[PDB]
């Protein structure tokens, strides 16, 4: 039935959009954390070179 | 209205493809984060002795 297929797709689509928003938020945060960690590595390199 | 079902199928395909890509980018970024944090810890140790 067209009605059944449509309802199933609408349900999947609502569920996928919520999963997508979650993953988008998690990605943005993880990327920000990676940038921080990499800049930590660089700051420590300079501090370890300014000491040694 | 006539296009209702195919548009839903198209959206569905679009979302599923985006979902897989984001899961892939997330796992890759998480792995890089783990490596960088581990570099920080390794460098903390070498800095400790000196």
Residue numbers in the entry:
A (entry chain A): 169 to 220
B (entry chain B): 170 to 219
What does the paper say about this structure?
They both consist of an N-terminal membrane-bound domain with three predicted transmembrane helices, and a C-terminal cytoplasmic region, which encompass ∼50% of the protein and is predicted to form a coiled coil, or more likely two coiled coils. BAP31 controls the fates of its bound clients, which may be either retained in the ER, progress through the secretory pathway or be extruded and subjected to ER-associated degradation. The structures presented here now show for the first time that the vDED domain adopts a dimeric coiled coil fold with no structural similarity to DED domains.
The structure of the vDED domain of BAP31 was determined in two different crystal forms; P21 at pH 8.0 and twinned P3221 at pH 4.2. The vDED domain forms an uninterrupted parallel coiled coil dimer in both structures. Almost all residues could be modeled in the P21 form (172–233), but not in the P3221 form (169–220). We have no obvious explanation for this observation, but one possibility is that certain buffer molecules in the crystallization condition e.g. LiSO4 lead to partial unwinding of the coiled coil. In contrast, BAP31 vDED forms a coiled coil over a wide pH spectrum although the melting temperature is 11 °C higher at pH 4.2 than at pH 7.0. This dramatic increase in stability is puzzling since there is no clear evidence for any substantial charge repulsion in the dimer interface at pH 7.0 (though Glu-174 may perhaps cause some level of repulsion), and since very low pH may in fact destabilize the 2–3 inter-helical salt bridges that are present in the domain through protonation of acidic residues. However, several cases have been reported of coiled coils being stabilized at highly acidic pH in spite of a loss of salt bridges. A possible explanation for this is that the loss of ionic interactions at acidic pH may be counteracted by favorable interactions between basic residues and anions present in the solvent, reminiscent of the counterion condensation observed in double stranded DNA.
